[PDB]
Amino acid sequence: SIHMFPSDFKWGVATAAYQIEGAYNEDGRGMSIWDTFAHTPGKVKNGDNGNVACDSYHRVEEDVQLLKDLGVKVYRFSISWPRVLPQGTGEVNRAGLDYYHRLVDELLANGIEPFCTLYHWDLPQALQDQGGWGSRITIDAFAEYAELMFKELGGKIKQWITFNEPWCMAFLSNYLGVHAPGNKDLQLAIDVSHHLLVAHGRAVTLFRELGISGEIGIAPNTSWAVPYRRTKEDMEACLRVNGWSGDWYLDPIYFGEYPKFMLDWYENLGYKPPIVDGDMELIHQPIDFIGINYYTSSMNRYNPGEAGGMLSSEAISMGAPKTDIGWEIYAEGLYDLLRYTADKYGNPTLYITENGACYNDGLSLDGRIHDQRRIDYLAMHLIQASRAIEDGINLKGYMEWSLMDNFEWAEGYGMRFGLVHVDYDTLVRTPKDSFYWYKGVISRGWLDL
Amino acid sequence: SIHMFPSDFKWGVATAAYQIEGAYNEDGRGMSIWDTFAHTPGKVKNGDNGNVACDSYHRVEEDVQLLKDLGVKVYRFSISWPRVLPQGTGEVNRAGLDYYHRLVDELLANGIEPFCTLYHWDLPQALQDQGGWGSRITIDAFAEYAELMFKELGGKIKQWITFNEPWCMAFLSNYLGVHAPGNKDLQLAIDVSHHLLVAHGRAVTLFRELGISGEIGIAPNTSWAVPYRRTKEDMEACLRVNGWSGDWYLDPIYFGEYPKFMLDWYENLGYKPPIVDGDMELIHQPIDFIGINYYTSSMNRYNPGEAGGMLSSEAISMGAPKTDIGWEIYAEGLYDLLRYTADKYGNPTLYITENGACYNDGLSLDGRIHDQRRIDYLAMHLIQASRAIEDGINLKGYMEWSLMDNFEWAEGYGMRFGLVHVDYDTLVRTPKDSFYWYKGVISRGWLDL
Amino acid sequence: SIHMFPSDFKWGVATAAYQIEGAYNEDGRGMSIWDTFAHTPGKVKNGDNGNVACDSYHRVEEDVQLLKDLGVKVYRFSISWPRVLPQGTGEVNRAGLDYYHRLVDELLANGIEPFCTLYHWDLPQALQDQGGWGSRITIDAFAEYAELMFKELGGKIKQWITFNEPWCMAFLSNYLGVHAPGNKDLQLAIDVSHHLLVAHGRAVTLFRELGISGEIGIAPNTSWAVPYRRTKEDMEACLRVNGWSGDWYLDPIYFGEYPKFMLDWYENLGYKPPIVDGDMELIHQPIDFIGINYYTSSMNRYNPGEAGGMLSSEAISMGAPKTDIGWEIYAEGLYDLLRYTADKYGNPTLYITENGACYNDGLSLDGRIHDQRRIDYLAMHLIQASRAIEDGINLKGYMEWSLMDNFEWAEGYGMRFGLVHVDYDTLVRTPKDSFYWYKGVISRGWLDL
Amino acid sequence: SIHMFPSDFKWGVATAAYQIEGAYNEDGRGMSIWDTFAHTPGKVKNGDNGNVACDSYHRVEEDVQLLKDLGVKVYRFSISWPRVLPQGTGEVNRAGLDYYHRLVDELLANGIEPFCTLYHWDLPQALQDQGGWGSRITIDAFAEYAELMFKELGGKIKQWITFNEPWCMAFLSNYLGVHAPGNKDLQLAIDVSHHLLVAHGRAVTLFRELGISGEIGIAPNTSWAVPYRRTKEDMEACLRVNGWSGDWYLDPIYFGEYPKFMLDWYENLGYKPPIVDGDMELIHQPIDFIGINYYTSSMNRYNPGEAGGMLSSEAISMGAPKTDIGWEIYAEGLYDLLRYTADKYGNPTLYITENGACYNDGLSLDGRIHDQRRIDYLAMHLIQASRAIEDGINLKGYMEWSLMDNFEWAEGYGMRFGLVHVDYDTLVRTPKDSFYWYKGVISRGWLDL
């Protein structure tokens, strides 16, 4: 069956600074909360860290070569805040900016549109020492940072993302303690969520004031959940899942207010966002697009007990196949999420800023990586992406997650999400079968599956 | 995650006369349309036929042993019409009835509840020579047949199914020409559908009049389809899918009228059911349960062109994993179908009379059949079955399709659906891993997946 | 493509006394030229002999069981002359006749038609000591032998073959010295050819006089050859190939004279058949059928040099695939041979008395013999057999060579021609995949290939 | 057996522009009907296209190196019409001509004789927009094209072929709709067949007028068929097979008239070639040779029903071994075809312009491709080629199909016909075992098989 895609569809791939760059202690780069976290014994699996990663800092040419070989039209990457402003504010490290300029220049020179992500969890340790995202001071620092990048790369980059996966940097980091800084405080997580949103709003305003042409948005990893039973309590239990991960950030931006149902939920628990008068108006700035980061979804039901958790929404195994990282495959969730976002936010421009599977396939004696499982996963989701477009949703692009295997945060290097296999011991890069497959999909513009 | 099942849940397994029995030309058994079809060159793959099959006719003890080893509480099987009435009517072949009595006695002796299926596509050739289901004469023959079985086994059997998968015996057989008799006439298929329904209604009436205690119903293989786009035309295109395969038979029974939308669809094409005055009232007889036969579902969209077919409903590949027979795995469709049936028909008693996967796994040098794929499939669907029960649907039982590998109709013996591996050359039966797995599920009454 | 076969087509399989029986020195059996030959160092590969073979002499029940499992309608076997008449003449060994009666009775009891072959190369050593087939005395001995068998088994057997593969027992044995007795004399080979024909004629006459109902014929292994070039000399070179192996025996029977072209060829070399006045008339007796033994054919060209040989007909490799015994696969040769025989001899009743492939496939760890190569070979030839029938040729039956692996004469036990695998060390018989395949072909009566 | 070949035998290999070149959108190359076809969803398997192919456009040196390593004396390639005349007529793209000049120069520099093929299905889309070969305008365009190439490369190339496989570009493309343009109209296919023949005749005339020394011919893929039964109707059914694919084109050229039997066949169906007065005389121009393209042949029989098709000639499976693309191996058909052509057309100069097998063998861990099946196939056919020469047929050369694996039209890249393995993902070329084998055959000039 032929799954068609628009002629002007933006095919791309994405990466993240700390996950691929390496050279963490070079050319005046300051430490980030992740350098600290990774260096802390017991925080990352096997004691892995992004010290070297894929060494992309010294392999701009190699990165771009993979990109032009893939035939990608858009490349999404992030800027390492500590690399341009080691202290988060003040002294500008030109050596860092030089790298990003060199990268962007190569991209442009090869017809690849840069999709820059300002913040991808690598907060400068200096700012963290001052309270990190828990302090409003960091909001100022981010505004300074954003303005700097807008002035530096704003003339070459016309695709900007303020924060990538707000829930992960806020709740998974400050509430669940799985990601840097590694705190376990619900209120703090809510504080961080509020401060990042204000920082975002201010960044959007600056983008507009600077008159720099292009688009700017935010990329939430809106968690999806399907109602176990057709009950009001189950549907609401599922609404809270996408509510505390996506709606919590998109609503203040689009409507100038946090989602009511979530506010009431937190309020009943004794939690409220530290809203300083004027904040909501700062956050309430029109953005050009929403970045959808999808990987999986669950089947939830209302449960007031421990099984339901803070959201009293218990997930129930569908018995579905899982990726090597343990996530269930529910391709239909992509369509459901896109449909939801399109309905609620007035069908704005949507870009799948992240979508991929974790499959640890290595090299066969063949010399190649036969990751059919990744191909199958991607194919299923691209079918849902095409479905959404056919269903009138404004999906303007798709960027599969991870160009190459990288530092998978707390999981270390064990989990592989890339199209290009990276042997971390020899740093040798070998394009997987999925690479060549995706290349063909991009070339054709359609899928015969 | 623990998927619970009611204490009184009827766990079972099913088979079909011509698919396992064998001894087609023994003890006075008359030929059926399938004996003829299978014997016709080019009709069945490799020229396979149910002459011997699994030889269950001579292995009653072996069959029952597998059943008690599995721990099954219910066993669904069918009666070979030509074996009890070689000419479809008149002379009663007691040798045939003896077999069924011996089987039923063994079942009862081992605490296994018989779930008898009167008609499973094996129409006596003698009746086919007179026009088969295209002639109203066959309706009389079936009424005679039903009455005979009700009087013979009615005292031991309290679970009766008139027709199994009406759409298959009607449309796939007389419209698509894939199954016996192998005709290609839409109107004829509609005629057959009407006549089988009248025969069903008359059989239900007889069941009531004979005062035989128990339950009686019909088992449709209601094809499921998911709307590609959230469009009225797509939703209607999907409604026609379940409409011409399930609603077309259940509506005349529950409401005393064919589904309006289907009537109009056929009418516009110049097709109408041969309704003789009084027929609808004969069909409109209350049944005790609905037998749900589920295996897969599709994703359809409206299409007036050839791609849409007669129903102008084009199926679009989900890119989902498929069984060895080529059917996509869409476990959620089970829940959707059960939910649909429960809503429309007043939440009647439901029994999943068929559900399984076609996986051709053979014996490993291990000596066992490691069919994890079948286990995974079953597990996923049982999770949906439990979901339905949790969602208030009256699902009272589950019977996985095929106790052992058998004659898969037009596919011959190549496609394996059973829990027990059957080597057709040596007729040796070896329980697969799925057998032992299902056994455990039945024993526990729940599933930890 | 469906290759149909007549409803009354005689499906069968064949064996040979010395190749399967065993018990060479039991129940008063006399030695044959093959017992002597095989016992002679250097005559048979590895020093193998038919002392035990498949031990079919003690396994009548097992033989017949394989036959009824195969679904064969006709079974062709041969009578061990030394087993019924140890000295070739005189004293009758009733113990031997008892075996054949027991075998025939079992066959008849299971609906298997016996196809008896009087002579299959096992000439009694006693007669060989008197000159063997080189002496006219043996003609008398054979007449006595034939009469004995006709009187003994004539009431149960209605299918008789006097001599099997005359060329092999004559030329390959007395001219090439590869088979028993192992002589190298062209004239002697011609003498033997003449004497066996007279013995045949006399046997046919006796068959008629005894009034025993049934059929009687001879089974030549008419070697086929295709003209390399469309030249008269090449066509004649090819005619001599089928001429000295088949025409040389069939012509005296059908026309009462040896083929002219062959007579002239031998005459020019100084060779002539020892025709005693009256002989040709004795040989010129009407037979009921011709037994065609086909396996392969070649591509020949005229060559007066050594490469052409005695017949000045040099074979040229077609580069075609070969069986494990080294014979090229030329299925079309079957049709060509049948067509030739049908044209020349007035389209008489034809029976493919031998056709199979030598494939040494053994048991896999599977426990089965996956001899797809044998299946493919048989299929190709059965397609040609069906072709011949469609082309109006009177082919009334097919008997694939070797029911089970046996003593392959000079090749010993190394070459396997059977449908049933025989482990010569343990004497265990295991039906190969070809067995089950052929069984299906016989059952259907057609072939979907 | 030694199969000898003449000392002056022209050993070669062949390729096709769109199948290997790549760089479809470079140096001003215009689109062809195949670029369009391949780019159309659902037209080519997996959505493959000749965009890159083997990238031979940028690898002239590599191509020639393989050629000199193979020891080939002749290299047959085709000119991409859209590459020299992007619009089919008018503006000459010198960049395209430069490539062909560079290739030809390298060939000549290494002692390799160029065998140029003007048309190999890649008709300029511009001409197709005007009706393509259905319009007589294209005849003019081809005449202009031919004249251009004759003037450009005529001084270096002395071996010219106007059209390659006329039946494929005509019937398979415009009647069966399997190849570009993809039409289904018998009359249109007949129109195209007529127009290409006129274009051919005009091209031959130009070749003569320009006084350019050398040879010029046409290469039909005359389909061969063997009579199932020795019946007149079957023989005629087989004559139509080679008649509508080869005789239909060769007769107007050699005799100045379409084959009578074919004319009558089409006429009875209501079809006639659009013969404009003077056309037959234009086509009736003496050619220097006939290019025989052989791969397989069938066994046909007369059949007025659907099974017989338009030609009422039903093919019957020989059960013979097949190549990986599904074609039966019938080596003898080569000899039969050559013999037929030699008899009918006055034994003109013949060149096997195409002959090879589709075997998808890839690299073993050995690092080499052990394609013994291709070697066996080639060997068998070369034996028939030698046979033809020995039989007095004027076979002056052999060119095995595909130097390297390439874009197999509608089959995409999945089917491999080359002597050199091409990994389409890495574009790495690895000589297969067949390469080294063929090299040896060319070196020796004979074959010991």
Q: Which amino acid is at B422?
A: V
Pick from D326, D402, D303: which is nearest to D14 by CA?
D402
Query: DSSP E strands: which ranges in C228-376?
Result: 289-293, 297-302, 313-315, 350-354
Per-residue tokens: D353: 């312009």
Q: What is the spatial distance between Cα C242 and Cα B105, in angstroms, rounded to a whole number?
A: 68
Q: Which of A229, A319, A391 sits opposite B390 (nearest CB)?
A: A229
* Residues of chain A contacting D39 with CB distance shorter than 8 Å: 444
Q: How many whole angstroms separate alpha carbon D91 and alpha carbon D84?
A: 9
E strands, A112-208, in order:
113-119, 159-164
D41, D42, D365: residue with CB nearest A365: D365
Nearest by Cα to D284 from D254, D260, D307, D317: D254
Nearest CA in chain C to D229: C391
**Contact (CB<8Å) D319/C228:** no
> Breaks in chain A at C–N > 2.5 Å: after which residues?
none
Kindly state the tokens that stand for D214.
């050398």
Contact B439, B71 (CB under 8 A): yes
Q: What type of residue sits at position C165?
A: E
Q: B209: helix, coil or strand?
A: helix
Contacts (Cβ under 8 Å, ≥6 apart) of D343: none
Q: Does B51 touch chain C (CB under 8 A)?
A: yes
- Report the distance separating Cα D242 and Cα D253, nearest Å: 16
Establish whether the linkage from the previous residue to C181 is cis, with ω within 30° of 0: yes
Contact C57, C427 (CB under 8 A): no
Reading the block at residue D45, the tokens are 């398997």
User: Entry resolution in angstroms?
Assistant: 2.7
- Say how many C-beta atoms besides its own lie within 10 A of residue A390's C-beta: 16
Instruction: Tell which residue, B70, B33, B62, has the closest CA to residue B49.
Output: B33
* Gap between the Cα atoms of D226 and A114, Å rounded: 64
Q: How far is A388 from chain B (nearest CA, A)?
A: 8
Cβ pair D126, D37 in contact under 8 A? no
Q: What tokens were used for A119?
A: 């913040």
d(CA A84, CA B378): 55
Task: Give A181-187's long-range contacts (Cβ < 8 A, gap of 24+).
Answer: A181/A33, A181/A37, A181/A128, A181/A132, A182/A37, A182/A40, A182/A43, A186/A269, A186/A271, A186/A310, A187/A271
Classified as helix, coil or strand, A380 is: helix
Distance between CA A407 and CA A18 in Å, rounded?
Answer: 8
Phi, psi of A116 (to 5 degrees): -85, 135
Are residues D358 and D297 in contact, defined by beta-carbon separation less than 8 angstroms? Answer: no
Chain C positions in Cβ-Cβ contact with residue D313 (cut-off 8 Å): none
Query: What's the CA gap between A76 and A55, in Å, rounded?
Result: 17
Helix (H) or strand (E) segment spanning residue D290: strand D289-293
D41: contact with A, CB 8 A cutoff: yes
Give B29's DSSP letter: P
DSSP codes, B300-365:
EEE-SSGGGTTTTEEE------B-TTS-B--THHHHHHHHHHHHHTTS--EEEEE----------T
Decide: B262 and B256 in contact? Cβ < 8 Å.
Answer: no
Q: Report d(CA C399, CA C418) in Å as an integer.
A: 12
Q: Measured between alpha carbons, how far is B110 from B208 in angstroms, rounded to an integer?
A: 28
Q: Cα C166 vs. chain centroid, distance in angstroms?
A: 8
Residues 6+ apart with CB under 8 A from A86: A28, A29, A30, A93, A124, A126
Chains A and D share 3 or more Cβ pairs within 8 Å: yes
Q: Phi/psi of residue A149, each to 5°?
A: -65, -35
Q: Do chain C and chain A touch with ≥3 beta carbon pairs under 8 Å?
A: no
Catalytic residue among A113, A354, A400, A408: A354
Instruction: Name every chain A residue with its beta carbon within 8 A of the beta carbon of B320.
Output: 331, 380
Q: Do C229 and D391 touch (CB under 8 A)?
A: yes
Distance in angstroms (rounded) separating the CA atoms of residues A446 and C431: 52
Residue A415 CB burial class (10 angstroms; 0-12, 13-18, ≥19): buried
Q: Which two tokens stand for residue C129?
A: 């000591």
Q: What is the phi/psi pair of residue D154, to 5°?
A: -55, -25
Which residues 6+ apart lie within 8 Å of C78 measured at CB? C15, C16, C17, C116, C117, C118, C119, C120, C122, C164
Q: Given an 8 Å threshold on Cβ–Cβ distance, is D41 in contact with A365?
A: no
Length of chain B: 449
**One-character DSSP codes across A394-445:** -EEEEEEE-SB----GGGTTSS---SEEEETTTTEEEE-HHHHHHHHHHHHS
Which two structure tokens, joined as six digits, stand for C342?
């049908």
- Active-site positions of D read 165, 354
Chain D touching partners, 3 or more CB pairs below 8 A: A, C
- Is D129 strand, coil or helix? coil
Q: Which residues of C touch B365 (CB under 8 A)?
A: 365-366
Helices assigned H by DSSP within D284-425: 332-344, 372-390
H or E, element range at A261 = helix A260-269
Q: Do A228 and B390 touch (CB under 8 A)?
A: yes
Backbone dihedral angles phi then psi of residue C293, each to the nearest 5 degrees: -110, 105
- Angle, vertex CA C177, rays to CA C172 and CA C178, nearest 5: 70
How is chain D split among helix, strand and coil, in percent rounded to 5?
40, 15, 40
Tokens of B125: 């050739």
CA pair distance B297, B225, nearest whole angstrom: 5
CA distance B124 to chain A (A): 40
- Enumerate the β-bridge partners of residue A218: A290
A234 alpha carbon, distance to own chain's centre: 28
Distance CA B273, CA C323 (A): 61
**Does residue A114 have a cis bond before it (omega within 30 degrees)?**
no
> How far is residue A329's CA from residue B393's CA, in Å, rounded to a whole number?
26
Tell me how crowded residue D254 is: count the other CB atoms within 10 A of its CB: 19
CB-based burial of residue D52 (10 Å sphere; 0-12 exposed, 13-18 middle, 19+ buried)? middle
The residues with which B354 forms a beta bridge, in sequence order, are B293
Active site residues of B: 165, 354
Contact C422, C429 (CB under 8 A): yes
CB of D326 less than 8 A from some CB of A? no
* Option in D39, D41, D49 nearest A2 (CB): D41
Which member of B1, B228, B390 has the closest CB to residue A390? B228
- CB–CB of A383 and B319 under 8 A? yes
Nearest to D42 among A365, A440, A448 (CB): A448
Q: From CA B340, how far away is CA B245, in angstroms rounded? A: 14
For chain C, list the domains and their CATH numbers.
1-449 (3.20.20.80)
Residue of B nearest to C70 (CA): B425
Torsion A14-A19-A20-A21 (CA) sign = positive
For residue D349, list its beta bridge partners. none
Separation CA A58–CA A23 (nearest Å)? 8
Q: Would you give the DSSP letter of residue C404?
A: B
> D363, D413, D425, D426: which to substitute to probe chain A, counting the most A Cβ within 10 Å?
D425
Helix axes A433-444, A60-70, angle to 10 degrees: 60
**DSSP string covering A37-89:** HHHSTTTSGGG--TTTTT-TTS-HHHHHHHHHHHT-SEEEEE--HHHHSTTSS
The residue to which tokens 């395969």 are assigned: B245
d(CA D426, nearest CA chain A) in Å: 9
Q: With an 8 Å Cβ cutoff, is B1 touching chain A?
A: yes
* Cα nearest neighbour of C3 on chain B: B41
Residue B131, sorted as left (phi over 0), alpha (psi -120 to 50) or beta, turns out to be: left
- Closest residue, chain C, to D391 (C-alpha): C229
Question: CB of B70 within 8 A of CB of B11?
Answer: no
Closest residue in chain C to residue B424, using alpha carbons only? C436
B46 lies within 8 A of chain C by CB: yes
Give the Cα separation of A320 and B379 in Å (integer).
9
Contact A1 B321 (CB under 8 A): no
Using a CB-CB cut-off of 8 Å, the residues of chain B touching A315 are: 1
User: A390: helix, coil or strand?
Assistant: helix
Cα–Cα dist D401/D419, whole Å: 9
Shortest CA distance from D390: residue in chain C: C229
Write out the two tokens for A149. 């990048």
Residues from chain B contacting residue C446 (CB–CB below 8 Å): 41, 47
Tokens of A401: 């997650």
Partnered with residue C164 across adjacent β-strands are C219
The string of DSSP codes covering C106-143 is HHHHTT-EEEEEEESS--BHHHHTTTGGGSTHHHHHHH
Distance CA B23, CA B99 (A): 12
For residue B2, give the H/E element and its range. strand B2-4
Q: Do C376 and D321 touch (CB under 8 A)?
A: yes
Q: Is C271 on the interface with B (CB under 8 A)?
A: no
| Count of positions (residues) in chain A | 449
Q: Which residues of B touch A320 (CB under 8 A)?
A: 331, 380
Asked if residues D411 and D28 have their Cβ atoms less than 8 Å apart, the reply is: no
**Rounded to 5 degrees, what are φ and ψ at A399?**
-130, 105
Residues on chain C touching B42 (C-beta within 8 angstroms)? 2, 448
Residues 6+ apart with CB under 8 A from A189: A170, A171, A173, A174, A175, A183
The residue ranges of DSSP E strands in D310-445, in sequence order, are: 313-315, 350-354, 395-401, 420-423, 428-431
Question: By what method was this entry solved?
Answer: X-ray
Decide: B185 and B270 in contact? Cβ < 8 Å: no
8-state DSSP, C419: S
- With contact defined as beta carbons under 8 Å apart, do D298 and D389 qualify? no
Place of tokens 């429960």: B342
Q: What residues does D32 pair with on adjacent strands?
A: D124
Q: Does C383 touch chain D (CB under 8 A)?
A: yes
Residues of C in Cβ contact (< 8 Å) with D317: 1, 3, 383, 449
Q: Distance between CA atoms of D44 and D47, rounded to whole angstroms?
A: 5
On whether any CB of chain C is under 8 Å from the CB of B364, the answer is no
Helix (H, G, I), strand (E, B) or coil at B159: strand
Please tell me the distance in Å from B56's CA to the nearest CA on chain C: 18
Binary contact (A318, B229; C-beta < 8 A): no
